[model samples]
Target chain A: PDTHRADERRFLDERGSSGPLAPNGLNPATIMEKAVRERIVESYFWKEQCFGVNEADIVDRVVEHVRFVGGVTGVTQKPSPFLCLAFKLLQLAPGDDILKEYLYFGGEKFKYLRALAAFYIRLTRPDKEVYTLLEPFLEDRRKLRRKGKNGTSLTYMDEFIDDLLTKDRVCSTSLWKMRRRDILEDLDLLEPRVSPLGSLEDILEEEEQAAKNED
Target chain B: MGTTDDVDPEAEYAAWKLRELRRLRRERDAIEARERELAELERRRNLTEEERRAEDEAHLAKQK
Candidate 1:
């Protein structure tokens, strides 16, 4: 329909000449490569569903459409709806406050919304912000369906969070290398991350306390 | 921050569809309340063709 055509070109120039702008010098749209970028915006899902979406609209879109997270999948390489929405997020480029509303959506049902926000924040923000903002997901245990080049598999939030810190490529975008946790801690940029499971002393004490009580 | 124990594609998507449909049912509940109020007002007129359809449709409306 002409509906898609009219609005398609409107934002598809991508961010346009906005001086309102992304955080730094470059347009955030350039974070995704030219080919992968075209594939998503031209994909079937993008033509119909990804049009005209801003911040709140994008959150609901992730709720309804984002069942899984992955980049382009299969030989023909159709973009996952998860990846498509990430591209749309770049097209919109909302502030950190708006992004955190998605980050703080924080419930079982809305984890995907939080996940999308974390991924976008990783893509756009500086290394310090990426580590500080997303370190919490290490404790979030929700399972995500992940589609890679070959087959799909079960991946959890903690697993995905680690990948953002260490893996070069995630959900089809190349991640900027962030400083190691120890390095950041030494720089006073971060403190040591608390382990999700308690210390060895805490665990041993708890079990022995139960044993003593039973006796 | 709980555990796993959730998966399978259509089961997830099907529940999504079901929850959305249940939202429509809630909308219809409000519609029923409004329609009933409108019908009751028409019946009190006790003087028009609308009252007759209102009477028949009341049985169909399954009056609360």
Candidate 2:
């Protein structure tokens, strides 16, 4: 079947052992590396799709990659780590129009892309922005199942977002280590600013105290 | 007419079921609201003719 064949191809692609090694040296690490990171940055998927690519086109590329390496049951699994890499390489900041397109595309049909967008924001944006962007998803209960060492397990968009916000690391798989603190601090360093202002109540209290003193 | 042994398990079960139903309904409503918001955003997005044409060409290539 086409599905089965696709699954096999994905399995081979992900294993990264079947491909030829670079000419410099045939080290084991080099042999098993898929260079998905390089592919993501250099490919038209990054240049065109990520830039001015239509929502449908972007989704099609994602869906194709997910289908290719993600097995027969397309979206019943966690999106491929390459999808995460694609977003990471793009390094698109939150509030970018393209990211918004992914966020607000086809309702439930693009939930996977929406999750990916959230992941991108969590990865590239600061702590406050990550919280503000992802907090609303706490109510989301749609399951995003993925294979783990123990076997298949269920998770939700809310849980994933929660973990991304609170935990230091949420390992999608053994290969992908998503460390939230490092990315947060990195972005924080890139755009340094003073701490946010005190609450409205604090300001009002100060004003009241000033009035009392003046009287 | 009241006895200590007259506790009705069926009535207790019915109450529990109603609570569960209400929780499920609330969750469903929230999800539906989010979906509605997304649908509205999608409806408002206007693609330029050039983008549409490019997308059409890409789709055609994929079909070939």
Candidate 3:
């Protein structure tokens, strides 16, 4: 079992001229696809049950429900960021009451829920309100553990808040921004109709003319 | 009429799996309960300053 095979030795011997053994292994497309799948599942579950709930009234209850189901089902990890994100994505019309509740929540002990609330407020509320609400967390050094599609990870509350302020999307659970391709597809530009005799350009021109006429 | 030593592997596996699931659920509930206790304590501890301020403000209003 310790000895190498003769063919393996031959392959090792001819290592050089084979030209880059693995071919720059990282593929962003596959990574993005996987990320999209994870977000879809996470968002679907959140939307199905928790959508439109008054977060200020039921945040603690929701947290407990997530914990119970996650534990019993074995589907979610402890410290599930998706669960927190679910709470964040609930319909939150702009208000100061929710902001106050989140701000006065248990510091450090329930820091993850607080951070999630902060992120939600930042996205939904005005800039002055966001700054006032999230500025205090900048000094918080307590680390929050979050589970992602890849695995579990940790980030300090200060850094997490900073990312929420600066980055477009900080975590996998962040809202998806529509890409240029998605916009074009929405307008039906990517799938132009084909004509048997005329060139592709001519078909596109005819289609554009028809759309203009209809408009 | 089988011997006491007789065992069914499938049944045994199912029982073991169920036991593992129950144990994990218990552990998770305990952790959640403990966190809730800590949060309650923190909430009480941090409110002392705010509560004191409110009382002071109310006292000042009564004096006026």
Candidate 4:
């Protein structure tokens, strides 16, 4: 009796001004393979530990859990908790204001929360806006660990952003297509990044500036 | 079901899942590669015309 329509309606009965419709006009979870989607929801953390109850529990959950981001991983081929929470954001798609709290929270300041919010921003926001917000994070250059279907690997924040911006398939979900940084400027979608004044400034800045001698 | 009890259906299923995911990814990649090239050609055409008109304005001096 046409469950595709029925299933979508169920996913979005909460969509009436409850956040916004995803650009594709269905639940974001629909982007993943239905089977993988089922695996994520069926997994333990989502069923038991999470239920996040709301944004409140989840922020702390990241503080406690989110060791790294990965796709289908483990011998069991299960979703990583990082991927679990990533999917959860798509499910909630909270309002712009609510997301800003994650995007810019402070205090001893859990930065992974910022990273998490960055992923949410790309799909929920515009390509122009996404680059502006995420490019500012090149400063988070510290190494982070991630797992894969086979094993763990080391990555950095900026490199992860590079993949999210450029890769065809990354982590678990397929990303919405985004334009090249230069191409966006051509469209007038963004025009701020163009710069022209680097005849020469070479020197490595003396390997991170006037260090006072070491051996 | 020749050796039904002998084979691990669980691992087999997992293998199939991964295989499907990789296949899906490849399909999406192939589709996107062509679509992106099309969009790229179109965007480039627009920019070409856009830049042409703007630079012409600077020197054409045909205010009529």
TM-scores for all candidates: the values are: 0.67, 0.38, 0.38, 0.62
Q: What would you estimate as the lDDT of candidate 2?
A: 0.47
> A1-215 in candidate 1: lDDT tens per residue?
56656655655665536424455345676778878988997898887788766677787788778778898888888888889998888777788678867787543458777778888888887777788778767666566778856667777676677678657899988766667665677699887555444444464697799899966
- On TM-score, the candidate that comes out on top is 1
True contacts kept of each: 0.05, 0.00, 0.00, 0.00
At residue A18, what lDDT does model 4 achieve?
A: 42
| Selected candidate, larger DockQ, 3 vs 4 | 4
Docking band of candidate 2:
incorrect
Compared with the true structure, what per-residue lDDT tens digits does model 2 show for residues A1-215?
Answer: 34543543344345325433312223222222244434443444344444433445556666554321111123333334445333432332224676767765631465566666666565555455565666666555454654444344555555666666666544431122333433445567323221122333454697799899966
Query: For candidate 3 chain A, which ten residues in a row score worst on lDDT?
Result: A65-74
Candidate 4, residues B5-53: lDDT per residue as tens digits?
2166567444443433443454457657868999978865777676868
lDDT tens digits, residue span A1-215, model 3 = 52323432333234334322211222212222334434433554444544334555345634544321111112442223334343334322324565566556633345545666666565454444454456556555454554434433544566666666545565443432323322344466443212222343454697799899966
lDDT of 4 by residue, A90-112 (tens): 77667777777887772116666
Q: TM-score per model for chain B alone?
A: 0.54, 0.57, 0.63, 0.57
Ranking of models by TM-score: 1, 4, 2, 3
* Native-to-model Cα distance after best TM-score fit, residue A53 in candidate 1, in Å: 1.7
Task: Please state the interface RMSD for every predicted structure, separated by commas.
Answer: 15.7, 20.2, 25.2, 19.4
Pairs of residues at least 3 apart in sequence or in different chains that clash in candidate 3: none
Each prediction's total of clashing residue pairs, residues at least 3 apart in sequence or on different chains, is 0, 0, 0, 0
In angstroms, the error of model 1 at B2 is 17
The best candidate in terms of lDDT = 1
Q: In model 4, which regions exceed 4 Å deviation?
A: A1-9, A12-20, A23-26, A106-108, A149-151, A192-215, B1-64
